[PDB]
Symmetry: C6
Subunit: 30 residues, 6 copies
């Protein structure tokens, strides 16, 4: 579990960063 | 061991980046 | 396995972050 | 070995990104 | 296998994020 | 091998993102 669980948590957080970064890009374009 | 500890630290830091990036998005959409 | 699935999700999200970050850079450059 | 060392370096750098992203958010919020 | 391929893709995408983030910093400096 | 090499490349790129993100923070705080 520990290594697999940490990688799953990194995956979830990285997906959230991706979405927020897309929102920033969209805001800056208008 | 060391690998599991490092991955747990990456998971924690990535979650913090996700939170902060969401705050940036909200500020710019605000 | 679980490790491969998580890493593939991280790869996909990191590509999305790269694209969105490039869009942010282009928006700020005008 | 090498894998653990690289992951430790990634952990340190991601913590620094977390700090800087929080600083960006606060600066934008005034 | 897939694990190595995903890490190679993460490396490439992270290099692109590094470039784009440097461009953002330069744009914000004028 | 391939996995260690990709992780070393991720470590370098992540350190460069940390540098650039700090530069962004400093620019906004100016």
């Amino acid at each position: 579990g520990e290594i697999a669980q940490a990688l799953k948590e990194i995956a979830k957080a990285t997906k959230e960063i991706a979405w927020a970064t897309k929102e920033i890009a969209q805001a800056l374009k208008g």
